[PDB]
Amino acid sequence: MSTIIFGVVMFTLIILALVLVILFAKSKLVPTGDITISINGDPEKAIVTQPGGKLLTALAGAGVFVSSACGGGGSCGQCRVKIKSGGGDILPTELDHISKGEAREGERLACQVAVKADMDLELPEEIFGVKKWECTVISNDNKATFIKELKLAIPDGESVPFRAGGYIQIEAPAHHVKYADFDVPEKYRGDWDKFNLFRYESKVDEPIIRAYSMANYPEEFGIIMLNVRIATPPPNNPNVPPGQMSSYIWSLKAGDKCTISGPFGEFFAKDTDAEMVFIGGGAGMAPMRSHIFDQLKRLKSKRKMSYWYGARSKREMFYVEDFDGLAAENDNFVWHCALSDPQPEDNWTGYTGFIHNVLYENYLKDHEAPEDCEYYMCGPPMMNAAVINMLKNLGVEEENILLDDFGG
Amino acid sequence: KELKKSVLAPVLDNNPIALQVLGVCSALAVTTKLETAFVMTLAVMFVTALSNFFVSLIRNHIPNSVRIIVQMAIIASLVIVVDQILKAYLYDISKQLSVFVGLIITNCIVMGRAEAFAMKSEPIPSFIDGIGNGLGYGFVLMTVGFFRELLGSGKLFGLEVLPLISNGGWYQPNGLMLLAPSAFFLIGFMIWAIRTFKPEQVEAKE
Amino acid sequence: MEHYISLLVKSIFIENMALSFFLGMCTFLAVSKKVKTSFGLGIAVIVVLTISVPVNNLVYNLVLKPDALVEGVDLSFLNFITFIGVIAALVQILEMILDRFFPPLYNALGIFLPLITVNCAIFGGVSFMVQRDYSFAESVVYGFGSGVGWMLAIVALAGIREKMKYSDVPPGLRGLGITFITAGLMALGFMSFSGVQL
Amino acid sequence: MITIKKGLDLPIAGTPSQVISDGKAIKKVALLGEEYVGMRPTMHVRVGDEVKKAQILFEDKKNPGVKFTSPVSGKVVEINRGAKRVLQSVVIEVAGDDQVTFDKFEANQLASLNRDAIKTQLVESGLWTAFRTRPFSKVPAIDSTSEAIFVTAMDTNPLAAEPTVVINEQSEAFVAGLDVLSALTTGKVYVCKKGTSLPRSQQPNVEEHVFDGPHPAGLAGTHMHFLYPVSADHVAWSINYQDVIAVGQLFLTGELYTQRVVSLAGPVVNKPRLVRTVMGASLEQLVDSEIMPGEVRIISGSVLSGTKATGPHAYLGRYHLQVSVLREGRDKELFGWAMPGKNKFSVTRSFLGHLFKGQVYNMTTTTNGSDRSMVPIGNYEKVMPLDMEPTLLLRDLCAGDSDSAVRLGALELDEEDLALCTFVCPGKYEYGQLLRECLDKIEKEG
Amino acid sequence: DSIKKTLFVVIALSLVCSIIVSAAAVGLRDKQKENAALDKQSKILQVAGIEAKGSKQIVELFNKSIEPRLVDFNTGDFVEGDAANYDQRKAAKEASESIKLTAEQDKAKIQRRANVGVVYLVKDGDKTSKVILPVHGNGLWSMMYAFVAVETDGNTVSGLTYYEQGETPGLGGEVENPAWRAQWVGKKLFDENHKPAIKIVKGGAPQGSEHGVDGLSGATLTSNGVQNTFDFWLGDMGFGPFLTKVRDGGL
Amino acid sequence: GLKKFLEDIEHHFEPGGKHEKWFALYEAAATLFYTPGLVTKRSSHVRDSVDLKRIMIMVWLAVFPAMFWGMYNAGGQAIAALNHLYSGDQLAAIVAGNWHYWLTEMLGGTMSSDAGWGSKMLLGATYFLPIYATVFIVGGFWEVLFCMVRKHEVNEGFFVTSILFALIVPPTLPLWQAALGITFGVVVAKEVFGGTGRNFLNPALAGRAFLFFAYPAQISGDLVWTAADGYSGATALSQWAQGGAGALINNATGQTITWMDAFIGNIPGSIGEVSTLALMIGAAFIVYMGIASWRIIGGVMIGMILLSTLFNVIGSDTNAMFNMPWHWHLVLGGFAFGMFFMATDPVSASFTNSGKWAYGILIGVMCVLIRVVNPAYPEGMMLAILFANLFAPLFDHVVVERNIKRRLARYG
């Protein structure tokens, strides 16, 4: 019994001594002072913040919004900044989106950058002109069986300064909506009840952030037009949650309110005299309408242009009148559409099959020099892989193929 | 059932020693005989389960400055109790197991489970994953000790199944099975056999 | 003089902690890709071991050895907790010291100290010191030699694994299996100092 | 003097007689689009178009501003294309005497000229493609400069011409070309040569350096390694003696000079000699009625580093100054690997052929063995004089490790620098292609 | 966070852990000591020829039959003390309770020797039937510890048992072979002049040898170790004076 | 003829044929008899004549003097030891009891003491040839299996591994142990790494280290090195460790082992390690051709001489191996077999001219060390080569790291 008391007291004193000594060693040896973060060169608007956190949360407070697609976490690759002074060393995950040649300039993903020392950032050429808006839904008309067109009105006459091919970010709070809430006209309804996709419903508990490409050109003031495809569970395993944000925008209707955040973008057209070939499909009609209307109307370019859209049926087609009006007034532009499963009701006398086979066998095969054109493309994933493969077998260089995958 | 997945996945799907390199030292050391492998498997099961349980009980109040001190205090107390129990009842196995009874404290399974799962989960699932990881560890230990004791000495659990020549039999024991590289070779070929049947575990050509 | 050099040569070659005693194998088998990284980790191991073994020898001989404080009281059941707590606290304090005061030495070797804070190599070194009943200078020399032997073995494995860039390993053996086989073939070669009694 | 001791002078049959004569009459030339490294052509001519001498045929997309011009005046008759529509050659039938002319200067004005005027005249004439940057062996960017321009006034290739015979006929043009290069370079021009005398340019920065020993003593990579080691941030340019003669003639006459003196030699050539020809001449007409009957291989350039001339690729290369013709070895021999070889060449001493010193071998295109892994017996060290580790660098090239390859070298190298390593490998590896793959990786990754 | 709550947590946890640990560690000391002792008790009962299974019968027979005593090596006379708890292996390293061995004196390569050693007397009623001498020596890989039982004359051997060794399990680990240990029964330790006469013979022993046992096969470097062990522990520095005292009489 | 028969059955083995799964064995026999007949396809349109076949056949032809002298010596030692022990009607019953003896007497030879060089080589062949055949077959099984499953073409290199394993083993190995040793040598040390040219250890001394540690009584002691029933006699690195140079004596003949006896090879031991003269005769040929490394050989010699001379200088009065000179280390054991044929393995050695010297020096130092100061093992050459195979890449690392700093200074 005499040994037990002694053992207990010495155990406790050893543990307490180690804890107190490590605490005291910590108190003197960690700063807890403050560091200053630097932006382009201006002494004004410089961020001071606790060393707790990363560069994303440190930039989030001072009103500087970096492109934070895919909710951070080192996935998108658009949270890239140039750091002049010593920040933090590279991470192997940052090497996935940044190459040894790019990294030399100072490119790093802001998310993995850990703020504990002062830094000097050279942010990409005055992107401080970014806003967070709130808009009133104008219409939510259904454009295809699985694609709905969301229009929004920017309030008080303000207009979004953006370029064709760019995108905005739409944030939504926690909610719960059911697929019975959706206004799906009887024109496109027959395919839904075949799977009875009205069954599903989803709910989220913290707000989400996603990006969407605009479907209007810069000189169409006072609005924003989008094309939003519904993201349903895959056919193989259908017991997984539906798309969080995709099911929200479909739940909106006239008069409702949503918030958007600023103009971004990298899918811009090059300024040359070369011919342009626009390839699209599905929800990829959004940038392809923005690029084409920018060329023929705002820039009024006289280059030769062409649009090759690939749909599944004539009920899946839309914006037809807008393109047929351009092909009549302008003789630089031409339009073609190819269906996979044309139905007898469609009255279809046109191209049939995949778009990568229709484009090749009709136009590219006899072209005098197909390597001399600029190819812009946006569509479903295996449409991008089929087209790129067909173009590479013609000699086209990847410096000419501009592809915008919808978030991989 | 939510139980059988959690207890039976770390055996082949997410095996500790064969996929999560944690835990090689005792597997290499104590698998010359099969009794020591069994006793070490049971001890690791007990310690991992109860340490996960207690760390998950007090997960909310642990300071971030002294987290390692608290977790290692719990684990070291459990291992000291286990070592005092082993000496009183199973005396001979302890002598053959001398320092790897204490080294259960620095075994990587016991700490990686307390850090990766117990700090973030309820008490009853942490007992479960500790038991499951102990089972996955004991799988490799017993499988290696079986071959080592059978071919190195011709006995299983101390029972003579192959009659040695120096005991009037026909079998001549392999001396490497009682030595150091044999455990490395056995675990390497076992990893080969496991990744042959479940080929999603194969690593990238890089 | 001959007593302390025989102990050093023994610790380095005759009783290796990596290939003879099998301590620290997960870090040994996981950080063996590049020679530079293995060298940094080995230097961290040398430092942590040579600082950890003598201090634990002092604490044991002052507190936990039989009859150290009161006649008829031995606290030898606190060896495990005392050793592991002292090792962890020492590693963390050394890491913080390097992190603040000497940034270059931090980027050099302090970036390995989280992997070594609680490792089987140092715990086994302290346990073997307690079993073998070393003096203070003997503990210093033993810790130093043990760290140097561990570093030598890990750097040799890194060199072999870099030479294996030309190999053609079956897909099921790629990685862990072939590293296990290579470490076994290294132990087969280190078995040459077996019969030496130094 | 720099003396090289590790190398190999190949004892192949058919050495030429260093006497210049007139070659066959040529009726077709071509420009080969696969011999320019990293070139993607933008075509400026169609089949049926008529061209003039020094008229543009195609440009480069990846190198803006560079023009590839016609050697002769005639009609575009073929635009050959291969896998994935890769341009193989643009064939032109020689007919007429038309040309694009430029400005002419006096022989004493060339040393004091504007670098931009020199660059402009070169790019417009299309003689800018005579240069190659090390690393990566590509045509220089028309808006870049170098501090070292290496002139190759020697030749150690097997069955090669001897530069002195050619330079003694165009001394004036050679000196004018060196005077132009002295003003074009920022720094020094290195005229790497043998011990024999050559015409001297008298600018203070044009220096003469003598190299001695067997092959590779005559490659630009050796000269760069010994005089101006190159790296990612130290680039040198390379040009040979006939291109310097062409530069001198261009700046002295205002006209593009397209005249080659190539060596036609080989074991199956009846009279090996130096012949006069034109840039890009047809190699199936240059060798007509001059080779023994049978099945042979016609090569543009050396047997160590050259292009096999068949079909659409059967035209004289741009950076090549010789043609080689040798038989095709397609025989199967009873225990041919175990015969005592009195007629078998080797760098090792496993055959009887080395005991007969001064022998000359009628070598074929045989691969004396099958493809096997690398067992290093020390053959790469016997033939590589530079200050590198051959076996480890070649294993880095094989394994595909680009970073350690760059560290161990691989940036000072061309495909012609590993020709002897490809030669003496007992595993029958081809290292020029592996080096080109590693350099493509390194140039693509920024 | 707060230092107050941190210290409260660590102190409470330390108390809760230390109570259990130090209660379990002290409550089991006597059982641990008994379990440690029963192994040596069983080895001695086995070398003495007595059959026993289970701690009950082992303790009963060891307490009724075997008697530990202490013997002074320098003079070979009995000394009084606590023989049941003597620790010769730890006493041998102590500077006061041991002696350093001269290079020529060290024939078995043990390098040290305690002043007093513990012997065990097998007792029948009150008559001393045998005496069990603990000997040890150095082999090729390890130190080898044995138990040799000698009859009252001080010459005849009744058994041998190696209870600790680490020689190759099939070459020099054959000192634990029962067929080899059975060769020792009936041998003689000393000759007519009372000098060490045990001989480990390379290549078999002639049948009828009173002094020779078969050496090990393929193991002449561990067999040399056993020979050196007996050469030392039967000499003037080992059990020589005590064995002369036993020969004269009065165990 | 044979050319016609080979190209007519080639359709049977191309994909879809009757025997397509045995294609790897057909392409081997097709290229063994006749050269492939291929041409260069890309560049360096002329190739050197050497290939792996000639390298392997030249390393194989070099060990024939050693092989034949080893067979003759095994026979002579066995006959002498037999006539030393038995005579009269015992020798007849000993001869009729062993097939190695009654086959030698059936094929025309004699087992009496007046036997000549012809019956001694016959008796030695009756021991060597079964081991060689078993090793070759059991290792070729695994080679062909790996090549068939991995769709490779079987390559030479095992042609040398098998013979080098068969000549470094005692004349009295069981055949199942030879099979196990060649299995461990080929499969574990070479084939799991990719095959020839892609491993890092010596495949023949990693199957001898399998049998030395697993079955240590059939490859050690005094009963395994003379093939005579009931004969127990020590060799000379074991007789020197016991009593020095005065203890070197042949018990079968009752004569002293001189320096010329160990150099010529009139001593017991591993089948073909005994004749330093024949080993030198073969090594001079394979070194002249440029196949073996004189830098590695010189390093081994330098290390052995340095360490043995240091041991001789510092001296010892309890260890007899401290006074063995360098010219006695050379002719005893498997020092010269290893220095000449097994240390010069190009795949396991260093890949740098500067690293080869250090590699050889380490091999020699470790051999002399394991000989002198390791009391358990009479020699240490399989253990010293296996040890240096681990640090061969580190020497290359040091040399390359020194070469890269020379580059960055723009002088290389």
Ligand SMILES: Cc1cc2nc3c(=O)[nH]c(=O)nc-3n(C[C@H](O)[C@H](O)[C@H](O)COP(=O)(O)OP(=O)(O)OC[C@H]3O[C@@H](n4cnc5c(N)ncnc54)[C@H](O)[C@@H]3O)c2cc1C
């Ligand atoms: C720059 C940019 C522009 C874009 N422009 C457009 C545009 O104009 N139009 C457009 O329609 N899209 C566009 N996108 C794509 C869009 O932003 C997102 O890809 C996606 O639509 C986001 O919607 P969501 O979060 O509701 O779907 P998510 O929830 O992100 O989709 C997940 C999908 O996987 C399934 N799933 C979810 N959880 C699991 C699980 N645990 N296991 C298995 N399956 C699961 C779901 O059923 C669903 O099909 C763009 C993307 C980027 C980056």
Ligand SMILES: CCCCCCCC[C@H]1O[C@H]1C/C=C/C=C\[C@H](O)CC(=O)NC1=C[C@](C)(CC)OC1=O
């Ligand atoms: C699984 C299916 C059953 C297995 C098959 C059944 C068992 C097969 C077993 O009999 C072995 C032979 C295999 C060895 C292969 C490897 C050898 O290294 C190849 C070889 O000799 N190469 C040559 C040697 C020489 C003569 C000189 C260098 O040239 C060569 O061609």
Ligand SMILES: Cc1cc2nc3c(=O)[nH]c(=O)nc-3n(C[C@H](O)[C@H](O)[C@H](O)CO)c2cc1C
């Ligand atoms: C000089 C030379 C020496 C060789 N020595 C050996 C040897 O000792 N053991 C072996 O298994 N193979 C040997 N080989 C064959 C070959 O190198 C060996 O199979 C490779 O290690 C296989 O990768 C040798 C080959 C050559 C050319």
Ligand code: FES
């Ligand atoms: S997702 Fe934010 S950086 Fe990649």
Ligand code: FES
């Ligand atoms: S056991 Fe030593 S690291 Fe896990």
Ligand SMILES: [Ca+2]
């Ligand atoms: Ca004693």
